[PDB]
Design a binder for this molecule. Structure first.
Ligand SMILES: *[C@@H]1O[C@H](CO)[C@@H](O[C@@H]2O[C@H](CO)[C@@H](O)[C@H](O)[C@H]2NC(C)=O)[C@H](O)[C@H]1NC(C)=O
Ligand SMILES: *[C@@H]1O[C@H](CO)[C@@H](O[C@@H]2O[C@H](CO)[C@@H](O)[C@H](O)[C@H]2NC(C)=O)[C@H](O)[C@H]1NC(C)=O
Ligand SMILES: *[C@@H]1O[C@H](CO)[C@@H](O[C@@H]2O[C@H](CO)[C@@H](O)[C@H](O)[C@H]2NC(C)=O)[C@H](O)[C@H]1NC(C)=O
Ligand SMILES: CC(=O)N[C@@H]1[C@@H](O)[C@H](O)[C@@H](CO)O[C@H]1O
Ligand SMILES: *[C@@H]1O[C@H](CO)[C@@H](O)[C@H](O)[C@H]1NC(C)=O
Lengths: 596, 135, 596, 135
């Protein structure tokens, strides 16, 4: 028939050439996809048996007519998707029956107007999407006042050319309504004078709207008197773009009040379009996919609380001294910038990942000029040379270096100051652990991710003595061959311990006797022959002991271990699948008779 | 099978994958020179999933010697560079994507590229193309 | 009782409590160190026995007297070291007998004058070292014209305050003499007018000479006339003096002709001293220990043929566009710096090693502006992002990436252009090799060092099919477990294969058949139990096959291998100490008895 | 015990290594504050070999936890910074070496450091100091 993902709950019926609904699917199903089937016409009582549906997908289903009361037993449905159906005209009470509907997706349905759109019935409606249609007007229909729960309306990819005073009349008589408007991909050249006066919006998206700089500047002026929380601006690569892009095209904006401002891709860009005076009173500033090359002479009187730089093109690390900036993201930069010392006395969050960043002299107060930093992400970067053990940054809770090249970290107690750190990731940093005091000072740490590294003489050393609060320890892929006596004796709170993908030839249970909280022990993909020690030293809290893909020696020499496997088969994972590798199938099937 | 062109240093063709045959019309004007090309990739199809998190797996081989899997992301899902990242499942996409590249030294011979398009949210194959490049 | 470093040839008698030369030292030795002994007096004939002596070291022996004919028997002595003996006066005939002496070291001997030093007989003399004495005079004596083989005089750390025109008369007289003069650590406050007029020197060292910047400016001016091949200028950390060091101090140097110019540590250093017009015609320019922070000024008409920046303080990568610079060395810089475009059309030699250097976009002609690059050292640096496979640099023959974070070198054929490369080091660059065509293009390669990396699934894949001219191959410490089948068959000239320190469970002889030229195979520190598959197949040429520090199985399954170890005794390294590791000493003692 | 001082956060002292006793008198002005210090190391001795390629092997221990072998090259053999580099076997050296450091976070305990002075060319040991710091 179809495909069954979750029994009695979720089914996939795509590209199955169905005429109508397969009406033998459980009468208690939650979610169903029927997209890409030539349904053609949607008869009445066709959906009737499924009283507990929530998600219906009828995308590109050749549908031209919705019969009156096509939805009969759907007073529980919340998501309805009708993308790419030549319905065109929606009759009175087309959606009669959906009283619990939250999201209505009417993209590419040949829909001409929101006036004729028979939705003034659906009280519970939150989101409405009418992108890719034949909508000419921008009028917010009067019935929207019955739509008490509506917050997002998508008007992308349409034919709206004017935003007039009359269009936004609904909003003007209703300043209490939290509403967002995606207005992207409309060819707008005229916005009426005083059209945006005394209106409030949550987020306004104006991407790829304007054909020339003159039209853009003119229109933004006539946005006067708008309060928006979030204004998304810019254009697309796969669209014909504004040739000349000066900062003065932004001029209209400082007659509107903006909380957060998001500029996206622009064909032309001037580095000093970000240090523009109309953006001074903004609390969050964002750049994404932007040709910015330098970010430097930003005025000190700017109110920016967060600054986000994603997939831009900086040739240099920015000079910044904004005294009120709490949060900074500079990530996925196109080139390979090196860190330049910065002064941000309010910073508590700093993501500088995925930049191939050089950082020589990491890290201490003088690098940042903050006392408040809790989150430091320097993952997926170049060479980071440790020379200072975070003096001045003891507020840190989250430190992430995964996949960066950490240098000199074994040279000294590089993390000594981080008394309050909860999370440390030094996985795939190529650190050869060489020093027993590497983790000294990490007394609060819960999570220690250090996969991919290695240890002197391939022996796991007493590096954990004082990391008492560890609940999670990943030591996978560290080429481990031997574990030192006492290494875990202090880890009383530890729950998961990953040592998969090493070269251990055996386990010794005594290594784990103090591990009273250990629910997960992953020892798979080693070369484990047996377990020495008193087998009763394995934690009674153990729920998932993974010993798959090892190489067990089914000799009488190890008769007790082999029994113990039968004994504990409830707690070992993929037990029956395990197979011997000595004298070649299987394992739970070892006997007990060759001298033993 | 589906499309062919030849530039001054390459012949380029594609067919659908043996495992998957969902329709896409992809084309490049002009035909890709491996030395360097400025032009557009024209794409016209009806996506079988949402394109909010579109990424490609590129499986490339040169004369049977195979390069490691290559992941390329086009839509990260937040303020994306292309108009088609907002395009939904079962929506008509018609777009031309401009591009350029400077050109490196490539060994002469036979290139196989299988390019899987993934919807990173669902993690399901959107389409699959089997490119041939003779250089 | 003397230490014997080379029986019958070299004896070491340092810091015994000796009173004279012991006669029980073989009258056959060529070198002897008698330093740190209370010798006190050099009694006549002391050394008459040892006639074949060449090197005698009597440093710190508390010698106050050298008797007549003290050196009587020493026909062949070329080296005599007298440092630190308070022989205040040297009488005529003090050095009589030394008819072969090439180097006299009379450092800290309390000498007061060259003029009264009895070396005028020593015609073989080449190097005269009189540093650390009580010499007040820079006069080069008349008897120098008999010392026709003298090429270096060290006059450092003496009390010379002046250089007069009659001090240098000998050199003026005999312009055919190759002399180097080390004048360091002399309180020079006055050089007479015209004192260096018509005088030629090979190397002249003036470090730590001048109490003041004016004193330097004013003394350099009276170097006018000098022709020097190598001038070394500067001061010492522990002996500073120069408050300021500006281009104008360098002024007297337009009147001197310099082939090579070297600047050493200075207390102060102005960046624009490198841009000084009187250094335009200099052929080799050098900076070591210098406070220089930016090298960017350089006029494009400067003639420099080489440039050396060693242990300096550059904040940025130099901007250079010098048309005749053949060779550039920037090494051991403070902090990180990232590579920036240079345009050096003549450039053949490039050492940018040991800089924690970050290079994104390695690399092509457009990074360098040169087509004649023969040597590229990028070792001991940070992130090197491979992005271009050396197009434009097809002449390269030596390439060093040792200990740097190489990136993306596996994503394409990154060395494709390098059809002339002879030497490639990618050791400890942390490369997981998952592309068989990584070395495509390297058809002339002889030496490939790639120790301390790794391979997909720890199998040594067919990456050497086209590297046919290989003579040295280092694959030690590569976590290798398995060797693919035809992996070495093409390497007919291969002389040295280091595969020690991997995780190989066995060898297979037939991997190495087809290595017709192999003389050394290192398979130590693996976990080799035996070698399977016909043992004749090991190359006839194989002279040194190391198998020590493995874990060999002395069971009946491997009778062939074990027997074979007995007849291949001569070709196996340290067979004397190889012990068993199965069913615990020794190995070659294994006998066919039960079953086998 | 050869010498000792105390500063606002350290008692420093040294003796010679058990197995190597060649004499050097070495001190600082002022005493070393681990917080940070600017001053001079005063060195006075007679080298057992040429100082042309002088370097140190420091073996450092913090509360018995030993750091990896640390190598500090003082004379590379070419245009070196210190006037003592040119000193020969048996030559008297009397010099004071300026320095300054800013100070990292240190315990809070007992420090051991064996400084082994090696003549790079011959690989001979010049001297060896058993240092002890209490912070
Ligand atoms: C322990 O570490 C390894 C990875 O280091 C994890 O193994 C992964 O398991 C997934 C399951 O989807 C495999 O398909 C992946 O290939 C593995 N990742 C690798 C090899 O990098 C493992 O999940 C970790 N154990 C636990 C309990 O989280
Ligand atoms: C000047 O005399 C000196 C002899 O010391 C020569 O300098 C040596 O030259 C050779 C090769 O030409 C080098 O290998 C040595 O290391 C040089 N020594 C120094 C200290 O530079 C120099 O070549 C002679 N010049 C002339 C014209 O005879
Ligand atoms: C194969 O590789 C290793 C490099 O790791 C070499 O091992 C060195 O061997 C010498 C023995 O004379 C030792 O003194 C060194 O300690 C070893 N070095 C290291 C880093 O462990 C080995 O020499 C290479 N094979 C050959 C033939 O040179
Ligand atoms: C791992 C190891 O020590 N291998 C040694 C090698 O160093 C030496 O060069 C050779 C004799 O030439 O014998 C073998
Ligand atoms: C071992 O089992 C655990 C829990 O069942 C699982 O999460 C983990 O992925 C397994 N380890 C490996 C290497 O597959």
């Amino acid at each position: 028939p179809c495909i069954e993902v979750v029994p009695n709950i979720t089914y996939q019926c795509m590209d199955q050439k169905l005429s109508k609904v397969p009406d033998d699917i459980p009468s208690s199903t939650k979610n169903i996809d029927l997209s890409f089937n030539p349904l053609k016409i949607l008869k009445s009582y066709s959906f009737s048996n499924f009283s507990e549906l929530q998600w219906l997908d009828l995308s590109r289903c050749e549908i031209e007519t919705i019969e009156d009361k096509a939805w009969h037993g759907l007073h529980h449905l919340s998501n309805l998707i009708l993308t790419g159906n030549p319905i065109q005209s929606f009759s009175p009470g087309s959606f009669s029956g959906l009283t619990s509907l939250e999201n209505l997706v009417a993209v590419e349905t040949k829909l001409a107007s929101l006036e004729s759109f028979p939705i003034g019935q659906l009280i519970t409606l939150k989101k409405l999407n009418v992108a890719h249609n034949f909508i000419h007007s921008c009028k917010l229909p009067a019935y929207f006042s019955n739509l008490t729960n509506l917050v997002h309306v998508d008007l992308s990819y349409n034919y709206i050319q004017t935003i007039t005073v009359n269009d936004l009349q609904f909003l003007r008589e209703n300043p209490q309504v939290n509403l967002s408007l995606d207005m992207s991909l409309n060819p707008i050249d005229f916005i009426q004078d005083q059209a945006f006066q005394g209106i409030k919006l949550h987020e306004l998206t104006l991407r790829g709207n304007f054909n020339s700089s003159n039209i853009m500047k003119t229109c933004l002026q006539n946005l006067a008197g708008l309060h928006v929380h979030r204004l998304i601006l810019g254009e697309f690569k796969d669209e014909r773009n504004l040739e000349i892009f000066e900062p003065s095209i932004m001029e209209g904006l400082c007659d509107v009040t903006i909380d957060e401002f998001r500029l996206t891709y622009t064909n032309d860009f001037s580095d000093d379009i970000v240090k523009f005076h109309c953006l001074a009173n903004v609390s969050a500033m964002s750049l994404a996919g932007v040709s910015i090359k330098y970010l430097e002479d930003v005025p000190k009187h700017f109110k920016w609380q967060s600054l986000s730089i994603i997939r831009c093109q900086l040739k240099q690390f920015p000079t910044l001294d904004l005294p009120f900036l709490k949060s900074l993201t500079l990530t996925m930069n196109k080139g390979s910038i090196s860190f330049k010392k910065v002064a941000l006395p309010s910073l508590s969050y700093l993501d500088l990942s995925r930049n191939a960043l050089s950082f020589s002299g990491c890290c201490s107060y003088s690098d940042l000029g903050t006392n408040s930093l809790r989150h430091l992400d320097l993952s997926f970067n170049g060479a980071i040379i440790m020379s200072a053990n975070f003096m001045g940054l003891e507020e840190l809770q989250h430190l992430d270096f995964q996949h960066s090249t950490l240098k000199r970290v074994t040279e000294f107690s590089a993390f000594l100051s981080l008394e309050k750190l909860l999370y440390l990731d030094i996985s795939y940093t190529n650190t050869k652990i060489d020093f027993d005091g590497i983790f000294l000072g990490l007394t609060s740490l819960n999570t220690l991710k250090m996969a991919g590294n290695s240890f002197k003489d391939n022996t796991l050393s007493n590096v954990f003595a004082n990391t008492t609060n560890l609940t999670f320890l990943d030591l996978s892929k560290c080429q481990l061959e031997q574990i030192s006596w006492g290494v875990f004796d202090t880890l009383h709170r530890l729950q998961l311990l990953n040592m998969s993908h090493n070269n251990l030839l055996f386990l010794d249970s005594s290594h784990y006797n103090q591990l009273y909280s250990l629910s997960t022990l992953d020892c798979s993909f080693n070369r484990i022959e047996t377990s020495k020690g008193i087998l009763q030293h394995f934690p009674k809290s153990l729920a998932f002991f993974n010993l798959t893909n090892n190489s067990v020696a089914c000799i009488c020499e190890h008769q007790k271990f082999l029994q113990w496997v039968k004994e504990q088969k409830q707690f070992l994972v993929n037990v029956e699948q395990m197979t011997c590798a000595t004298p070649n199938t299987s394992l739970v099937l070892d006997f007990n008779n060759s001298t033993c | 099978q589906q499309w062919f062109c030849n530039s001054s240093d390459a012949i380029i063709s594609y067919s659908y994958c043996d495992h998957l045959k969902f329709p896409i019309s992809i084309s490049s004007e002009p035909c890709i020179r491996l030395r360097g090309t400025n032009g557009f990739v024209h794409v016209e199809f009806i996506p079988r999933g949402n394109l909010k998190y579109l990424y490609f797996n590129l499986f490339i081989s040169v004369n049977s010697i195979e390069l490691p899997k290559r992941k390329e992301v086009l839509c990260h899902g937040h303020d994306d560079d292309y108009s088609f990242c907002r395009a939904l499942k079962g929506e008509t996409v018609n777009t031309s994507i401009p591009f350029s590249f400077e050109g490196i030294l490539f060994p002469k011979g036979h290139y196989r590229c299988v390019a899987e398009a993934i919807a990173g949210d669902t993690e399901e194959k959107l389409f699959c193309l089997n490119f041939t490049i003779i250089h």
